[PDB]
């Protein structure tokens, strides 16, 4: 006699190629200064269906997206004058805050090592996005 028993991130289809903690800035052109956009895990996500690789970064605690853009082959990581543990680059289509907007980003890491590992992985992802 059987007794009756009592009664979506959108990152589902992606492989995590690379993850590192980071602080992300955007350059406000009008006032010539960097502004923090978020701190948290920066992830490299490769879509299983398109093999395309994106950067996705979410803020700690609130988990709000502060970066979401294809790692474009045309992009170039440049040093910032103040830092040996950051990269600056121009991004033409980021969708963190809704509609696709262009930004100059800066991303800083805990160490030079992490910044160097990031750049290596960033250029690897660029090659993947080429094929």
């Amino acid at each position: 006699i059987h007794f009756e028993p009592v009664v979506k991130t959108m990152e589902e289809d992606e492989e995590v190629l690379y993850k590192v903690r980071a602080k992300l800035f955007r350059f406000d052109k009008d006032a010539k200064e960097w502004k923090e956009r978020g701190t948290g895990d920066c992830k490299f996500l490769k879509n299983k269906k398109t093999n395309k690789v994106r950067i996705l970064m979410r803020r700690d605690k609130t988990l709000k997206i502060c970066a979401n853009h294809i790692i474009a082959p045309e992009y170039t990581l440049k040093p910032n004058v103040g830092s040996d543990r950051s990269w600056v680059y121009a991004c033409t289509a980021d969708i963190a805050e809704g509609e696709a907007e262009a930004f100059t980003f800066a991303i800083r890491f805990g160490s030079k090592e992490n910044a160097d590992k990031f750049k290596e992985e960033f250029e690897k992802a660029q090659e993947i996005n080429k094929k």
């Binding site: 979506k8 959108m10 990152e11 800035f25 950051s86 600056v88 805990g110």
Partner: protein, 196 residues
């Protein structure tokens, strides 16, 4: 869907800095005094769907107070702010509370002691007891370091939605699609001493 939140407290306690941190992620180091009130929509994603706060960030300087308690009409929740490095700001908390509850008689209110990042704290943890008889939630926060920065809104959302187990959840991440850079390269990143 949507809730009026009023944010009150003495000038310089960090109301606007806290709000901006939530809106854009940024930390504003400059003190530009709020003139009357600045209204900002602020959305969080939760396990019970999106919740939107319409945040009425009010002026703390008397000279810039504008409509004052006129701002509180139909508030559905509030944050009262002080600065743990400044005793006069805690001293005035009962004054802000009084003016607020005279207009908003039964709303959830968070008391926040801001700037706990500053080594030399003046309002001792032991001293902070005003919330007890007034049924206010209390948090030590820092807009600068983000210490507990999310708690005031998470608590208010639980009270407003009527769900003690409501949590912030990751927003869905949709597939993404000139001397401007040289200036960015040669402008130094702020706070190069920080851990991140």
């Amino acid at each position: 869907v949507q809730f009026k939140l009023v944010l009150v407290g003495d000038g310089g306690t960090g109301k606007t800095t806290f709000v901006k941190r939530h809106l854009t992620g940024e930390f504003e180091k400059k003190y530009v005094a709020t003139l009357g009130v600045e209204v900002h929509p602020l959305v969080f994603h939760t396990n019970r769907g999106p919740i939107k706060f319409n945040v009425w960030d009010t002026a703390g300087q008397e000279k810039f107070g504008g409509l004052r308690d006129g701002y509180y009409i139909q508030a559905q929740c509030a944050i009262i702010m002080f600065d743990v490095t400044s005793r006069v700001t805690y001293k005035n908390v009962p004054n802000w509370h009084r003016d607020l509850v005279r207009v908003c008689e039964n709303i959830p209110i968070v008391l926040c002691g801001n700037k706990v990042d500053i080594k030399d704290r003046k309002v001792k943890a032991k001293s902070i007891v005003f919330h007890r008889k007034k049924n206010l939630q209390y948090y030590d926060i820092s807009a600068k370091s983000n210490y507990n920065f999310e708690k005031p809104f998470l608590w208010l959302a639980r009270k407003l939605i009527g769900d003690p187990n409501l949590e912030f959840v990751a927003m869905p991440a949709l597939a993404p699609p000139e001397h401007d850079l040289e200036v960015a390269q040669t402008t130094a990143l702020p706070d190069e001493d920080d851990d991140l």
